[PDB]
Amino acid sequence: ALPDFTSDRYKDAYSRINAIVIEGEQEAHDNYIAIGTLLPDHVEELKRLAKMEMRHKKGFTACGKNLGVEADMDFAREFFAPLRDNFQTALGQGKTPTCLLIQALLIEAFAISFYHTYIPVSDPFARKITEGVVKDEYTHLNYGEAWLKANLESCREELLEANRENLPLIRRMLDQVAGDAAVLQMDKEDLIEDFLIAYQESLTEIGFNTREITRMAAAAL
C-alpha cells in the first residue's frame, strides 16, 4: 500500500532520503566534471552527463518542496563522505579506472536501484520526476561500461582493488538507508537485489567472467 505522504512519520524519513538523492546528484555532477580533468578529450560528453545530474538534482529538490519537507543536507553529506573521500583520493592520484568504478558503476547502480524501488511507492508528483531520471542513469552506466570495457586489459587489477575498497561502502550505505527507506515503503531486499543486478550486468559488459564477478560481489562481505 502507498504511504501517507502527508504524515509526520513520512515527512521525517523523506527529509533524509530526499537529501541523500539530492546530494548524490550533486556529487555525480561534480564527479563527472572531475573525470574530465583525467580525460580531457572526453570533456564535452562528461559536461553533458554532469548537466543531466543537475537536472535530476533540481527535480528531486522539487519533490521535497512538493511534500513540504526540508532536506537534511548535513545528514546526506555525511552519508556520502566515505565514498566521496575515496573518489577524491583516486582523483588526486590520477586513477581514472577507480574514479569511473566509483561513480559510473557503483553510484549509478545504487541510484538505479533506488529509483526503480522508489517509483512504485512514490507520490504522483515525484513519480513523474523519477520516471524521467532512470533512463538517464542507464546512459551514465553505459558510459562507464564503455570506457572500462575499452581499457580493461590495462586496469583489471586496479578495478579489483577499487571494488574491494568501495563495494563494502555501498553495502554500508544500503544498511544505513534501510530504516528510512522502509518508512517510504521500500524493501531493503529489493534495493540490494536491484543494485547487484545492475552492477553484475555492468561488470559482465566490461568483460569480467562469472568467477571474477562472483569474487567481486563477495567483497561486500
Instruction: Pick between residue 11 and residue 56 the one whose CB is nearest to ligand CCCCCC(=O)O.
Output: 56
- Binding partner of residue 21 among Fe ion, ligand CCCCCC(=O)O, none, CB under 5 to 8 Å per kind? ligand CCCCCC(=O)O
Is 78 within any annotated ligand binding site? no
Residue 180 near residue 17, CB atoms below 8 Å: yes
Taking the CA atoms of residue 81, residue 122, residue 197 and residue 47 in that order, the dihedral angle to the nearest 10 degrees is: -60
- Binding partner of residue 208 among ligand CCCCCC(=O)O, Fe ion, none, CB under 5 to 8 Å per kind? none
Please identify, among the stretches 113-121, 131-139, 169-177, 204-212, the one whose residues bind Fe ion according to the rule CB under 5 A.
131-139
Q: Which residues, in sequence order, are CB contacts of 161 under 8 Å at separation 6+?
A: 98
Residue 220 near residue 167, CB atoms below 8 Å: yes
CA atoms within 13 A on the CB side of 146: 8
- Tell the smallest beta-carbon distance from residue 139 to ligand CCCCCC(=O)O (Å): 10
Is 25 within any annotated ligand binding site? yes
- Binding partner of residue 192 among Fe ion, ligand CCCCCC(=O)O, none, CB under 5 to 8 Å per kind? none
Instruction: Pick between residue 10 and residue 143 the one whose CB is nearest to Fe ion.
Output: 143
* Residue of 175, 155, 151, 174 whose CA lies nearest to 163: 155
Site membership for Fe ion, residue 56 (CB under 5 A)? yes
Q: Could you give the CA distance from residue 63 to residue 208 in angstroms, rounded to a whole number?
A: 38
Residue 195 near residue 134, CB atoms below 8 Å: no
Burial of 44 (0-12, 13-18, 19+ CB in 10 A): exposed
Residues near ligand CCCCCC(=O)O, by CB under 6 A: 21, 24-25, 28, 53, 56, 107-108, 110-111, 114, 137, 140
Site size toward Fe ion (CB under 5 A) is 6
- Tell the smallest beta-carbon distance from residue 216 to ligand CCCCCC(=O)O (Å): 20
- Residues in contact with Fe ion by CB under 5 A are 25, 28, 53, 56, 137, 140
